Amino acid sequence: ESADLRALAKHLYDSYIKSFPLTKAKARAILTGKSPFVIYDMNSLMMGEDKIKFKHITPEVAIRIFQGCQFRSVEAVQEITEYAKSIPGFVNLDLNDQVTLLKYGVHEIIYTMLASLMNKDGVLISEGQGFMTREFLKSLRKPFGDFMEPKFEFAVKFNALELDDSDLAIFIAVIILSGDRPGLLNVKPIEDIQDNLLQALELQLKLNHPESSQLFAKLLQKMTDLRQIVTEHVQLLQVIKKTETDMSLHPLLQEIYKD
Amino acid sequence: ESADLRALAKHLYDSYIKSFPLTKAKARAILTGKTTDKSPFVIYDMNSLMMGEDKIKEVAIRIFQGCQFRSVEAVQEITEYAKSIPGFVNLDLNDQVTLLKYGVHEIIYTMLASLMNKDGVLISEGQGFMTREFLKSLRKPFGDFMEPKFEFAVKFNALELDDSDLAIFIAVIILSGDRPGLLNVKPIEDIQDNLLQALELQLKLNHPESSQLFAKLLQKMTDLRQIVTEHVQLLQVIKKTETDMSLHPLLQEIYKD
Residue positions of A in the annotated binding site for rosiglitazone? Predict the structure, then answer.
């Protein structure tokens, strides 16, 4: 029923508004038209640490930036976890499956929502008070210099689809309820829910983007690009964790950012 | 107009039959035990392999080079099919070559699923059947060659696509505007968008109770890309450790990254 699909869409939208403080609408306002403090080079970074109250700085710069990304990532996990619970049927799932879905889903969602905070020039940080430039991020040591660059490449393509929060809310739900995650015990109710969400996304896009032919298909294809980015991120993150990170980190901190 | 999309589906299915001698329909009739087709000789060990080599036509290398010869033939078929996709031959030639370069492997493993069950794979135009176990037991490098293809095939075959569906899906894959080094993405994307429309409708008409088959089919792209990457990096091993082994020019040129 159309009405029920529209109902699901509104429920998801409202839940997303509650779960995610910095929405695409808000991000887009900051980027185009207070105003963000820009970090373009070394001197601006250090000044940025004075002006902005970073929560991650624990008395090299490349590591400090990376830890900042880790801090935010861990915050995002909790926002996503809360959003998941609002999705009709999620909480009724086997508890191991819930964990499994979030375990493998959060990375894809992080980069989807990061795209909201990005343009081709840089990324909003610290609740949109900051803006770290893309160029500045590129010009870091060989490990960390290629960290965020494939996220920007993804974001530029993704943002060209010009989705809104109401679209993204349904898209994110679809990602979470993916029946193909390893270790799942009961795929039936997972795919039944995703079916329902996919139907709602379809209608949402048709109503919200009537001129954009096969936006649905295009959005589904981007999910493939997300999984590609995530596999590439993870393998890079193994080098980092093993090589340079666990050398400079406190044991407890390693536990928090164990991933 | 959905009538235009049906005509397109008809066109593509027709070109697929003409381009690909061994369809899924034929493959299934062989694998099931249907009387439209005949039974295959089964290779499950060194002995059967050797006996099979008599009837049908280092063991691990000889198998590998046979599979590579078949990949060459597949590339030829896929190239012929691509030319039939409306708009394709009108693209910049460099783009044509780039689309085939990255497209063929995703297609090869897609259509290889048609020849597979959980137990093994048809070979030599359906005359043979090589077991999964046998393939998995080969010398260390060549052992985990085919395993990921089977794992993909098991899940991909769960969709229960027929050839008509595959024809359009294969077309979608070729016309990917996200391939590295494309000169004109917009013309490619416009073709793919019409193909996607045609696929959508095809799956709704042909599989009317299979809910969100369209969305599920597109999600299988992830699995496809993974197979490719594993295969590529497996071939690098063979190049370093087996400097005696030749590689067909067509395949070299595809693998060139």
Answer: 70-73, 107, 233, 257
